[PDB]
Amino acid sequence: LFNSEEDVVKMSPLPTVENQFTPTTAWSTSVGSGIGNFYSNLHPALADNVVYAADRAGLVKALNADDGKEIWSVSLAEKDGWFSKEPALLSGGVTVSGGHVYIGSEKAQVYALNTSDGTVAWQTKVAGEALSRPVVSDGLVLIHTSNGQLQALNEADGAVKWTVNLDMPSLSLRGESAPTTAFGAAVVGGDNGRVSAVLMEQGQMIWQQRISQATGSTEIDRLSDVDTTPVVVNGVVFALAYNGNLTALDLRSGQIMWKRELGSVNDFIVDGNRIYLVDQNDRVMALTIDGGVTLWTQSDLLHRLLTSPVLYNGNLVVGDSEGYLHWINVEDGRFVAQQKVDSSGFQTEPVAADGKLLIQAKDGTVYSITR
Amino acid sequence: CSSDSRYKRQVSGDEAYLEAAPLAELHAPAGMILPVTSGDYAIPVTNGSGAVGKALDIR
Amino acid sequence: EVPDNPPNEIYATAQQKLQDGNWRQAITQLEALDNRYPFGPYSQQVQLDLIYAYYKNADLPLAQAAIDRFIRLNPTHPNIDYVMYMRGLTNMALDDSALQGFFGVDRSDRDPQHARAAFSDFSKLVRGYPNSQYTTDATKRLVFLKDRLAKYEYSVAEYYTERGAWVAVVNRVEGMLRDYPDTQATRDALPLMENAYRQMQMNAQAEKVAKIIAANSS
Amino acid sequence: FVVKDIHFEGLQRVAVGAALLSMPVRTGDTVNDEDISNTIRALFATGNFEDVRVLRDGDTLLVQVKERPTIASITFSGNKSVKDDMLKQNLEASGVRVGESLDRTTIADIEKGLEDFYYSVGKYSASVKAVVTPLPRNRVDLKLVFQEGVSAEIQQINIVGNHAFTTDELISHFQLRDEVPWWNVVGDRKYQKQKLAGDLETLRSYYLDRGYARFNIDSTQVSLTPDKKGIYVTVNITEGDQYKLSGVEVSGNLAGHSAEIEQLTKIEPGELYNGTKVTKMEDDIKKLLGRYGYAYPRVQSMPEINDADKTVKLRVNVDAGNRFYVRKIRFEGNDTSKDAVLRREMRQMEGAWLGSDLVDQGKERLNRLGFFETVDTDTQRVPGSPDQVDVVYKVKERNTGSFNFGIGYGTESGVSFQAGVQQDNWLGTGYAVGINGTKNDYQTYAELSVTNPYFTVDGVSLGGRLFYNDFQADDADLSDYTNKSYGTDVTLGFPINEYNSLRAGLGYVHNSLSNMQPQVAMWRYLYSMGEHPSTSDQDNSFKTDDFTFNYGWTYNKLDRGYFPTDGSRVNLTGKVTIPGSDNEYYKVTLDTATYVPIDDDHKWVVLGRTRWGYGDGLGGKEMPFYENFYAGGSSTVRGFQSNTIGPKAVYFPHQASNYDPDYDYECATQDGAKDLCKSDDAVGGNAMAVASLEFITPTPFISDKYANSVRTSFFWDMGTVWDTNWDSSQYSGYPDYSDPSNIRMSAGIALQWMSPLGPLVFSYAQPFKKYDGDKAEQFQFNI
Amino acid sequence: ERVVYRPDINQGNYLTANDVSKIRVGMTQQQVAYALGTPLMSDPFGTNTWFYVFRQQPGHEGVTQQTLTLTFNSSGVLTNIDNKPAL
Q: What are the protein's UniProt keywords (chain C)?
């Protein structure tokens, strides 16, 4: 009886299912358990048809495009953990800069694997698991970790450039604050309702702005935890704090041009003056950059755990954790193509790169998509 | 048999403190005197109005 | 109980069932009167009639909250003497309610927690209202109550004699001494301190008690 | 200009003057248009006025008021199994209730606190909706609507900084659970932040017993996963290295007991450090000095953790209290029971130094009381002197008196009844009374059982038991076994230890038999008596009067006398006849009752319940047939009817019972056949081995107001009563019961309900591998 | 009769052999009260005699007691240390 008393929240799965352009796959190959139904900051990389797919249990591959045959394949589940072949437990997403495949671990043992074979270019234990993808740029393996730390590591051996304290959430109030480089400033968001710029060159706070409060005494959403990844349009940061506060603001000082404290925002891109985002209700909206004014929107997808909104094959491709693909109109929110290529769900973002659209699904993992 | 109107009654009651207990005080020899009223057992023995017990009722 | 009615007719139905003896259903009025009209003029007297009805319907903690209410609701009132009396009168009835009295079984050896609390209220009556409508009544309680709490502590102090705890005999009956100057349980404890002295070889201290035995024989 | 009158319409439990004092301008005060507006928000500052319209007719005020007060009711519509009074505790916190005002602006704010109620549980998939429904004259019923989707549940733990111990083993070591498989079904695994914080200290002790004396936890961060479910937890610890207990340095006021302290510090220098073990040994000092009298020993240990050799040295700083703390003691919870009943139940004396264990000893006597609910106390040190402590034993008592189970036979067949009742120390006076008996038109029986258990200070247990069964087995008359059985049993209780206690007594039984059933085994006792009865016609009469010494001993280390959980109970009981008895025989008996807690939160306890007994004759006799062992029904095996475990005798072909009952009660008479017919009524053996295998289990569906009062236990109840000297020559075409493999097997569940008349134990139970001859009752009614 | 088994009886509020060496005749009550604290029995009506009386009974083996009463004067200065052993 006790199981039959709890209700659920309703969704809007798929009205106006259109396929007015046909959707298909570039290849569908499924490298398997990995990303999983388990919650994972890990996310693949795609470059030059060397399709860097991997598995959180340890198996790290590189695949070939158009077939998903493996260019190379290794594992990092070798002597890890307390019983020597534990799972690797990867936190940060797949980063490939040069001949190194950098992946952050939940062991906080970050890596670099030689992109020719998968052999370890370097590997280094860091402080705290990676809340972000290990942002490897300028030699710095810039990682915002779980302990509210900015760790830049060397991308040649793993020499930690600094471990600089950041926005510290009380618990692991989630949401990736990606350490991004903009105008020489290490620009990182925050799980405390703040965004910031730190020094890229040393880890010295350029500014940190109150983009106001997060979970704790004004509790914001824990079904929709805000992507605090900053997306700067060169002079104007367009970033969310951890209550869904999109903000136009200064990069050098953080001084606000306009903001959108409106509640938690799932996923987003700042596509010119057309900010395409996965809104609060798992729904699609187009905001502008002169204000966060709705240019157009779509509420056909409600409470469908969408992926990041990308523009591929001419239209707004948003996959979901229901395994469906949806080519939304780049104009007012209409399906252009719809493809349930997966049943396991897309937890990772559509890498609409290398001519393809790469996801790593949950257990139907590597499908790569075109139209 | 005896019950003829479905009573919830013919039960116990109280009388006891209307049979108030007389008390025999100190008669002890001098020098052998103890502060025997050190407890709170010393009331103003006052007989302001009203009956005693069940004769004393109100609305 | 009673819906949103004229407050007097709820009281009239209360004054019916108060005088019907139907405190089963008078409290059905008097609470429902105090449900929507506790600020009425007789609604303080409704609480006084609630204490009246709770007692006759044997609702002593509900009376006790209502008595404590009238401490707070009307700390200036003529019927606080009623409230002070009925608190101890509750604490009279709250302390012992067993049916063993027809079997002649003592309940003064039973726990006098509310009988000590009635010893507050009945004495706080004859202190705070030595003139009131219950002061002849409350004094009759305390005269009975003083030996009753003594026969409690007597039945305690009897046991150390039975235990042979002669150290615990004397200080208990010295406790009975300094508390109770006059009670017969202490007057029956008067030979016993002499005994424990002789069991503790305080015969010389006992023969001083034996003169007090001799002085307080009568 | 100046107010001449205030027209204040609308009050609702706010008095006129109570609002008028909140007003700034009153009955002759100068009034401007600011005094209009000042009066508006000041009457709004009452917190009880929905709308305030202060106007004035020229200069005399008029205030048009709308009223917030009494909330008429609050409906918690569809709340959940989560307690709505606790949701009303969120309401009681927010200044609003029945009889109180309600601003309609604070709806979502309390609803946020209603959600932060769930957010404190670990639920945020939840929506709360307070509907402010207006009721007469201003009033409001507050229907509250509750849409709680799911909560968050413990999913994964990530421990970083750990290097020596696997995380998943600690997940089992913590109460933070993350699986309920079908291949290993366990309890559930939901979230609470209180469970984490203690399980941090689980890990803290876990490293403390190792010797990780530079261990700490840095921080921890549980994932606020975007689902409102996913609990993944970064656990940031500083493991440190292993340190060794290598020196104890006790110091301070050792009170001349430092040698005894050194017995409490009998250690190995260089053993791996265990500060949890130190935590005991500091209290061992407090147990040492407590029973020495010092109830307040200031013990301050200090681990001088020497990291140069990776060791711990242990400073300890001791400061005892005073010896003669125990002045007197107090007892509470004898409002209907006797003070001397409570005063006898202790071992620390008033006016001594403290025996700290004697307090616990007497509290165990109150725990071994049985007619108690709680054994609590308050060791209040009466201040001013360090010699005055009053230990205020506030105890609580349970039920008293218990009536038996009766069934049928009344007002259809005359005035006939099965009776029995208890008094449970006769309302706690000191007189252990349970009195039964039954007058029927089949028999007549009475039984008094009275004991002053503490009749003298050495626990003299004033045992007197009298019996008179005018048992006739009334078909119509003395045709089928009358037996007027009567006599006494006077016993006394003897202390052997404070848990060991002896039993002894003498037994007088006088029986007056006539016209017994033609059972050869029944005659085989009479043949062992030397008497030669009719195997044929039931005519035999028998007058006996045995004089019999009784004895026994018990071991009572078992926690509660009404609802224990740990320990075991031994009860030796036996009887031997003396010269002068009409039969020379013996019979001994022994039963076991072990309380073994499966989990030491004591919701799961092994109840080992067995029965032993052997009795035979002395000088060519037998132990009598009524002393043969019976079971089934209730006694130790449920799933049967009573008297269904044991050997079974055979009627001999007889003709008349001195009256042939016409096709009733036929036992191979003329109306019956003329052959040896075996009756399947279990006539019992000389040996008894029957067991009850019971398992304490909690209930997750009952309020623990009285789920503590009930006792649910499963069983497979089984065993064998068998006669080691049963024959296979007289019982060749019948079962020989010298086999102990006469195994009657049953199984079921115990269903206790503690009524005000005590426990009402019920049992559905069925036999599966039962030995034959059993009368079975599936659902049974016991006490 | 003679029953060899009997649980023991004791009663404290006494003084040890160290305790009498702490004090002497001429000390006040208070000088004793810094050394010995308070008794659990003083005089009922008389002088300042501080009663520190041991009692112990094992059972069928006699009785053990040390009656040590400390008669201070009316001023509270000590006048008698009454050592009394068992009977």
A: Cell outer membrane, Lipoprotein, Membrane, Palmitate, Signal
Resolution in angstroms comes to: 8.9
DSSP reduced 3-state for D449: strand
Q: CATH fold of D71-150, please?
A: Ubiquitin-like (UB roll) (3.10.20)
Cβ-Cβ pairs closer than 8 A, D with E, add up to: 44
- The CATH class for the domain spanning D153-238 reads alpha beta
- Helices C190-199 + C135-163 axis angle, to 10: 20
Six-digit token pair at C103? 């079997």
Q: Which domain covers residue E76, as residue numbers?
A: 9-84
Determine the 3-state secondary structure of D420 from DSSP: strand
Contact D160 A108 (CB under 8 A): yes
Amino acid at D352: A
Do B34 and E44 count as a contact with CB atoms less than 8 A apart? yes
For residues D500 and D535, is the Cβ–Cβ distance under 8 A?
no
Q: What span, in angstroms and rounded, lies between the C-alpha atoms of A336 and A313? A: 10
Q: How many residues does chain A have?
A: 371
Structure tokens at D552: 């026994």
Q: What is the CATH number of domain D326-396?
A: 3.10.20.310
Distance CA C28, CA A359 (A): 71
Question: Do the domains spanning D71-150 and D326-396 agree at the CATH topology level?
Answer: yes
E-assigned strand segments in D115-229: 125-134, 140-150, 153-160, 216-224
Assess if residue E74 is contained within a domain. yes
Task: Determine whether the interchain pair C136/B39 forms a contact, defined as Cβ–Cβ distance below 8 Å.
Answer: no
C197 touches D: beta carbon within 8 Å: no
- Experiment used for this model: cryo-EM
DSSP string, D753-768: EEETTEEEEEEEEEES
- CA D503 → CA D434, D448, D463, D571, distances in Å? 19, 19, 10, 9
Q: Which of residues 130-159 of D touch C (CB under 8 A)?
A: 136-137
Which of A171, A177, A266 to mutate to probe the D interface, most D CBs <10 Å? A171
- Tally Cβ neighbours within 10 Å of residue A15: 11
C neighbours by CB contacts (3+ pairs under 8 Å): B, D, E
Smallest Cβ distance to B44: which of C130, C134, C146? C130
Note whether C167 contacts D339, CB cutoff 8 Å.
no
**Helix, strand or coil for residue D16?**
helix
Phi and psi, residue A341, nearest 5°: -85, -20
Number of domains, chain E: 1
Alpha-carbon radius of gyration of chain D = 38
User: What is the domain partition of chain D in residue ranges?
Assistant: 7-67, 71-150, 153-238, 244-319, 326-396
Partner D contacted by C95 (CB < 8 A):
yes
Residue D152's alpha-carbon distances to D120, D127, D221, D223, D646, in angstroms, are 11, 15, 15, 11, 57
Domains of chain C by residue range:
1-59
Chain B residue closest to C115 (CA)?
B17
Cα dist from C71 to C55, C80, D100, whole Å = 17, 7, 20
How many angstroms separate the CA atoms of C67 and D525, rounded? 74
Q: Is C87 on the interface with B (CB under 8 A)?
A: no
| Residue D230 near residue A39, CB atoms below 8 Å | yes
Q: Between chain B and chain C, how many beta carbons pairs sit less than 8 Å apart?
A: 148
A190 has a chain D CB within 8 A of its CB: no
Q: Does residue D547 contact residue D510 with C-beta atoms inside 8 Å?
A: no
**How many residues can be counted in chain B?**
59
* CATH superfamily of domain region D244-319: membrane protein fhac (3.10.20.310)
Reading across the β-sheet that carries A45-47, which strands appear in turn?
A45-47, A50-52, A59-64, A70-75
Asked if A40 has any chain D CB less than 8 Å from its own CB, the reply is no
| CA–CA gap between residue D285 and residue D265 (Å, rounded) | 9
- In chain A, the number of structural domains is 1
